[PDB]
Write a protein that binds this ligand. Structure first.
Ligand code: R75
Length: 132
């Protein structure tokens, strides 16, 4: 499988604590995805979202600071996971979120960029009121 790396950065009008909670609380994920979610907020914990179209495992969870996860869309080759790193930086009580995605199937680059930039980032901002 040819793969690609993406890097996204986005600033949210909330604190790192509140943004980290949004990414790691099953009921908050259900809210901004408009779908049932299962999320085990533990190192080794599994997550399943959006009718199983997104799933994976958390591999590193440092509250308010970073999340590392194995992450996939359901249509990817079975057992193929991207590694997604989320880093939370306090900038004047706003949060600069840095997303790095490695191991994304190359044909799926634009779908995955849209998934993070539009669905996660704009969905979180619209659901919780964290700025434009
Ligand atoms: C990236 C997964 C995802 O993140 C969200 C955040 C807020 C609202 C919906 C979603 C959402 C989806 O439903 C979804 C489902 C499919 Br299938 C996709 O091909 C894409 Br792309 C996105």
């Amino acid at each position: 499988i040819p793969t690609c790396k993406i890097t996204l950065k986005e600033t949210f009008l909330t604190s790192p604590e509140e943004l980290y909670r949004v990414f790691t609380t099953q009921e908050l994920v259900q809210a901004f995805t408009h779908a049932p979610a299962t999320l085990e907020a533990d190192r080794g914990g599994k997550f399943h979202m959006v009718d199983g179209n997104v799933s994976g495992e958390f591999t590193d969870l440092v509250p308010e600071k970073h999340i590392v996860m194995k992450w996939r869309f359901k249509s990817w080759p079975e057992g193929h996971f991207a590694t997604i790193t989320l880093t939370f930086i306090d900038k004047n009580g706003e949060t600069e979120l840095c997303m790095e995605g490695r191991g994304i199937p190359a044909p799926e680059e634009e779908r995955t960029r849209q998934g993070w930039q539009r669905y996660y980032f704009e969905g979180i901002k619209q659901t919780f009121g964290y700025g434009a």
